[PDB]
Structure formats: structure tokens, C-alpha cells
Amino acid sequence: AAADAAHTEDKVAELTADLQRVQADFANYRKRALRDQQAAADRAKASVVSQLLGVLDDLERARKHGDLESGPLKSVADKLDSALTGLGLVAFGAEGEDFDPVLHEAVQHEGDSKPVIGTVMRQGYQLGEQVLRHALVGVV
Amino acid sequence: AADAAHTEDKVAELTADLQRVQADFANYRKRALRDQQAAADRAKASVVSQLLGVLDDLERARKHGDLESGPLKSVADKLDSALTGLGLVA
Amino acid sequence: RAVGIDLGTTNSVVSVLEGGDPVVVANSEGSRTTPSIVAFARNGEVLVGQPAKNQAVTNVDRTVRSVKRHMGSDWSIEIDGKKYTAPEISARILMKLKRDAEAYLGEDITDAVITTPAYFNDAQRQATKDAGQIAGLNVLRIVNEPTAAALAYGLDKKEQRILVFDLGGGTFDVSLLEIGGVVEVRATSGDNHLGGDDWDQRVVDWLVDKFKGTSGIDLTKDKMAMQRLREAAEKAKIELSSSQSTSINLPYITVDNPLFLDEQLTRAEFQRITQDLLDRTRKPFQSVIADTGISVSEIDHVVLVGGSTRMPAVTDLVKELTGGKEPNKGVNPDEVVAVGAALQAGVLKGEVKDVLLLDVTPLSLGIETKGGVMTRLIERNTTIPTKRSETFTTADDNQPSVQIQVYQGEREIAAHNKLLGSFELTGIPPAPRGIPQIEVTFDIDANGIVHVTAKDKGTGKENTIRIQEGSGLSKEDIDRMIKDAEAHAEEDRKRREEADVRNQA
Question: How does it assemble (chain B) (predicted)?
């Protein structure tokens, strides 16, 4: 009947309006086979450095306080940082540089005018182009 | 002229088309998502190759008994504890 | 297109809809939870997340930390401005999430559902909606966190009775909802100053007191040591939902001799110092029970919502407030709300139900190959109405006919798998192995009816089978195949046969 024909037309229109949407979404996700394919895996690369950053900072403050400025463990730290440098370790927050919020985890503000780091309590660390942990800097 | 049979055939065909397309979408959304985790093996890379040498150096230092001090005894243990989860033993 | 956003006083998770499923979009710097410290810059460049928080520990007064704690009330500041309006601060993290949804492949994320705590008000809903529309993101559902979490876990029916225990992290919320033909909530109440941050501050204070006991250092002005202690405490708290024996040791706190702080913080002490915070829960639960007609067994299901609910004390309290009933599992508690918001966004604009996704999984579909081995064609959970292809070849030289058998059962050994049928194709001219190509397709429709057909690409010989036995299996036995397949995980014997195929060529 006329009502049955109208209902059938509505169903056909709905299915047609869904088919092209699901096809377009399928194509968009197919594009992801090369865009974020290495990003999700390289999150593991980010993690295998986010875990070691604590030990890196511990060695850093060991050298800073002179308890490990030299010695076999200082050589161990040197070997570690030299090996990781190939992966793209570019320490940021160097002393005397501009305070970058996206790069520096500023905690203590000893002086309230270009912001600048008073001291790197913890040296920031990097893995290629992925900002891992903002540098713990005392903005002065 | 009514084309009721034609409309019913179109209903039975577009429903199957929607089902096939959504199934292809889900199948590939599971496929590429499986590669997202298969590439974790590549993400492993030589990170352990760079960590195991450090572990071996600190262990060889430890064999002489140096890692029996106070604050000097923290770094090696912390490194080993963090590495064991994401690295193999010597 | 649909986006699931869980705005929060401490965290915020965003999750967009990839067809019929939600996925929690990671933020710019890899993480999923954007720390909702919407802090303005030194000059103009508004930051959200950790890029804003790192500028807040130094600059306390150039930052709005929590906004979900204030609805309608002007918790507003000014930064080179003049009385910046309050909800726009959360609209800023909403805009950040809208932009960051493009981290996963998207074009224009213009539909989203924002979530609000159970403790609600017309003012609160209006403020959240105004923030959403200011952020440039059309919103139609402002679903309460309880019902959003319930939808995330899946409750869309008898007369369900869903309980919610929103630990939150900074705010608390408990409620019992009876899910019927409509979304129903009775009465909500809970702590507003209580959350996991209080557990973190409690362990921080315990560590400070222990160090003051072991040495005279104040540990209240060494800001670097304060950050070290706070990070250590948070790490220990998250790790305390495992390995009940725990300890931490910060290497260098402060020296003149480097002092070596070291405490073996035990979850026993965690409860001993957090029992007041835990017992602060009793009043809201008794209140929500007594507000309406409720019995201890009247609760059907309970869901753990909010970050850091994995603490054993809270699970014990929930299972001692109703009985030995276990809660629901599957979605991470810090992101259950965003998943629910995304699912509701999909439902509202017509992206679920219909005839789509009613198909779920035709268990197993495959064809057994030479050597007691089966070649999978349709993956285990692949949506039922699929289509596939495979070019097979005769296993013997001058083979006149090839018989192919379809088997179900994910086990690589087809002997233990169930026999469904056998179809043999004849008319193959005598030819050496390698050149022939036999096309195999699995054609399956919405109802679950399977079609397996083999056609000769080289000549044109075609035979068909209509096993149709994929459907009709009892649902109870389906779950047994999961255990049967998972028990023999280390099954790599098929590689031996694959190597033995070396005879060809």
C-alpha cells in the first residue's frame, strides 16, 4: 500500500545514508595504516625511556653533588647516555636559557621580565621529537 | 508500475550491503589494530641492547663489592628494578 | 564523528566513535588523561594540560586548577584580562580535546557528549552546556557520570538496579540507579572534598613525619624535595594495588653527607592513615539507601567509576555495603565515563542498533589445509556479514580433484575441531602443482548463514557448499571454546609443517 511504500522508502533512504558514511569512515581508518601505525608502537619507545628517566636524574644529581662526579658508576652513566644518544636524547632546560612551559616543569619560583631557569634540579630528557618529561627548572 | 518487488529487492540488497561494509570496517579496524601491537616488537628495538651493556657494567662493578655503600647504593638498584620490567637479565 | 568527553575536576579523557565503537583518544603528549589545570601563559598563549600545569607549580596565582568544583559560582580569575568568565576555563580544555581528537584520524569532530557528576543542578547542566557550545562543539546529552558509566559497561534493557561508586580522585559520588525502560536516577549525595588526592597527601604527610623522626630536617621548604616526595607517593599509591609489600627510596633529598630517605610503606599503614577518609563514605551510602525504598540485595549491578578505584579498601567497602557481589569490569575506571559518553553520542544520532552490530562474532570460520592444518579466512570476532578470498592450489601433481573441508574451532589442529562439511571440485586438468589457482570465498549474511564456494581461476570449474552450521550453537558452549583456545597458547607446531612445505619449488 501507500503507507507500506512510504515506510520502505524511508528504510531505503536510511540504509543509503548509512552506507556511504560507513564506507567513508572505513576509508579514513584505512588511511591510518601508515599515519599512526608507528606512533602507537613508538609509544613503547617513549615508555622505555620514561621509565629510565628517573635513574638518569638520579645519576645526574649524583654527579652534581660530587658523590659520583667520577668513578666506575660515572662511566656507567656515560655509557648509558652515550648509547641512548643514538635514539635521540636531546636534554633541554639548559642553564641560562629561556623558560619554555611546553619543555620545562618549573616548580620553585625564587624570584618574582624574561623568565629564566635558576637551576636544573632535574635535567629534562628527550627521545627524538617526542617531549617526554618537562624539565624540572627553578624559574628566577 | 508499483515496483513493490523492486523496492523489496532493494531493501534486501542494501541491508546486506550495509552489513558487508560494516563487517569490512570492523575486520580492518581489528586488522590494523593488530598491527598497532605487532609493531611493538619493532618498538622494542635495541633499547635492551643499550640497557644490557649498562647493566653488565654496573654488575661487574658490583662484583668488587663497591655497591655496598649508602647513597652510592641507590642508583644501581633503581636501574636494575626499572630495567627488569622492560629488559632481560645478563 | 561522535566524541565522548569526561570533563573532570582533576582529569579529563576524550573518546571518539570509530564507527560502532569508542576509542579513548590520546592527548598531544601521548597520554590520555589531560590534567585539567587550564593555566594561562606568561603572555597570551593559553596552555592546557601539563604544558599549563608546569607553569602553575612556579606561578601559583596565574592558574585555575579545578573548575568542576564550581558550577555557576564564579571561580574566575584574570590574566592580562578583565574578569574572565568561569565556564570558559573548562571550555578551553573542551577545545583542546576537540583539537586533539584529530590525533586519531578524523576530519571534523562536531558531535560530543559531555559528562557531569551525579550531584547535579539545572545551573550545573546549563553551565556545562554553555561551556561546550562556547568551545565550538555541538552537544545534546549531558548524561550523569553514573548512567554514563552504566551505559559504558552495557545496560540498555528486566528491571536493572545499577549502583555507582565514583571515587573520582578529587570528588566522591555514590548512587543507586534502577535502569528500566527509561534512564532513572533517584537521589545522589557524597563527599565533595574527598578523593584520591587525599590519599596521596596522606602518604606524603606520613613520609614527611617519618623523615622528621629520623632526622631534624623540616622538609617543608625544599621544594625540589617536595616534588620528589609527592611523585614518589603518587607512584607508590598507584603501585599499591599490587604487591602488598611496598617500599620506596628517594636517593638525594638534602645534604649538608647525602641523607638517604627510605621507608617501607605498607598498605596496612595506608589504611591506618586513610581510615577516616574511607569511613567518610559510610554516610553517603546509607543516605542513598534510606532516601528511597532500597534493600541490601535490591542492587543488581555495581560499577567502579573514577580514577584510582583499584585501591583494595574501596573495593572491600563496596562489597561490604551490598554483599559479596562483584562489580563490572572491562573498561578502565578513569575512562569509563568517556566511553559511556561516546556510546550515548552514537546512540542519539543513529550510529548503533538498527541491523548493524547485532552481528557480533561467528565464533570460528576456516578451511583445513594439507597437513592437519587449517587456513583461517575470517577472524574469530570478525563481524558476521563478511567476504574473503584465497587462491589455493592442488597439493599433488596432475591432481584431478581437490577436496576442501570447512572447520570451526580456533585450535590449529583440525582433528579436535568440529567437522562441518566437505566440498570437492572436479574437472581439474592434469597440471603440475604451483600454476593452478583455486579461489575460495566465505559469503555470510546478517542471519549467520555461511556460504563457502570454490572456483577454478585457471579453467572455471566451480563447486559450492552450504554448510550453514555456523549458527545455532549454544551460547554456553561458546565460552568454553575461549578457554580451550587460550589454554594452548604456546602452540607453534604448525611452523614445522610450514617448513615441511619446502618440497614445493
Answer: Homodimer.
